Amino acid sequence: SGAIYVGNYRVVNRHLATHNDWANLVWEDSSRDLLVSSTTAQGCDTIARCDCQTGVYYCSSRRKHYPVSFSKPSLIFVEASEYYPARYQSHLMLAVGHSEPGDCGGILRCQHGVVGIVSTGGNGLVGFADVRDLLWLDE
């Protein structure tokens, strides 16, 4: 679990969105596994606006942060699950590292701020849904 709080927005994995998230929906994209809902309280997370390929992610299944090198956002095939059939997930970045399904929502950060959130895994690769292109999260 986990989310990004920036301004009046809450960014979560779409497959983990709550009833309140859908009742206050701003934007959602199934192909990216992202959903953004509105909030009453102001958020203070900073979104990175960069092309970094190195950062640190929080892994709840180990209560640890790990430094990783990750690929640029791209279309990657993701196996079927109870939330989606087999498809290509867009804007996804991969790194060599540990993750379990419950790690989704963990933040990936670089020196400039929040890069994305844990969204996929398996076979020793962790995938993160990028948020750096969503310039409207700041305005």
Ligand SMILES: Cc1cc(CC(=O)N2CCC[C@H](C(N)=O)C2)ccn1
């Ligand atoms: C972080 C993680 C997730 C899994 C499982 C995984 O990849 N799923 C299941 C949940 C939805 C995901 C998606 N974005 O389509 C795909 C296994 C290890 N680590």
Ligand SMILES: [Zn+2]
């Ligand atoms: Zn950066």
